[PDB]
């Protein structure tokens, strides 16, 4: 019964219809990341940014968007390992939650939540955020230049993990991209499941998430039957 820590990146939701928030391209939905994902871009033109996420939140809840095979396998993995499992995601979508996972740590926030520019308090939110809402309100999404959420619990799980699995994460966004090193530093067996290479991993597989993830999860679960 190994302790397992899984870190997921935008890639896993790609097959579900949620266009990967590129960064090497610098364009997220035809928008500059510095313009829609930095505290500066916001203060500069809040209306536009608000509109940008309103559109992201909207699309997130459309019929054609649902968890894929990779999300589901991760729910099966949690079902099996219970308290020895921890899922950390850099994603702001709720596909892991819809698949069946619980206690998912959203280090970069959640698209279906918001917070007030003054108190910071958080409250659920599924619709659009209009110029007429207050405790002012902004997306509960960690922008570049801001501090990730749950870092204390994440770092604790990393020091405790027997197996650290990084799924479809681009070795480009830190601190998340540095987790593999931490895990490896504490003796964990590191695994990388990605569409493509570019990511200290002892075991690695490449190909569509909905194919690679379920396969690895099955191998692992069977392996410790």
């Amino acid at each position: 019964k190994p302790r397992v820590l899984v870190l997921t990146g935008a890639g896993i939701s790609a097959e579900s219809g949620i266009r990967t928030f590129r960064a090497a391209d610098g364009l997220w939905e035809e928008h500059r990341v510095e313009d829609v994902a930095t505290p500066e871009g916001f203060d500069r033109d809040p209306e536009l940014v608000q509109a940008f996420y309103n559109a992201r939140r909207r699309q997130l809840q459309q019929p054609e968007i649902q968890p894929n095979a990779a999300h589901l396998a991760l729910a099966k993995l949690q079902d099996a390992l219970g308290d020895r499992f921890l899922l950390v995601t850099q994603n702001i979508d709720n596909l892991h939650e819809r698949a069946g996972n619980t206690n998912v740590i959203h280090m970069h926030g959640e698209l279906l939540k918001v917070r007030c520019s003054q108190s910071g308090q958080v409250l659920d939110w599924t619709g659009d955020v209009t110029p007429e809402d207050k405790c002012p309100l902004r997306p509960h999404v960690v922008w570049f230049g801001e501090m990730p959420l749950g870092m204390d619990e994440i770092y604790m799980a990393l020091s405790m993990a027997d197996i650290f699995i990084a799924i479809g994460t681009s070795g480009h966004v830190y601190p998340a991209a540095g987790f593999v090193h931490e895990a490896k530093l504490h003796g964990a067996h590191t695994v990388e499941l990605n569409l493509e290479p570019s990511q200290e991993f002892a075991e690695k597989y490449y190909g569509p998430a909905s194919q690679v993830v379920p396969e690895f999860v099955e191998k692992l679960l069977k392996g410790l039957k």
Partner: peptide, 8 residues
Amino acid sequence: KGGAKRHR
């Protein structure tokens, strides 16, 4: 620990 969200 870890620092702010950032891109290499």
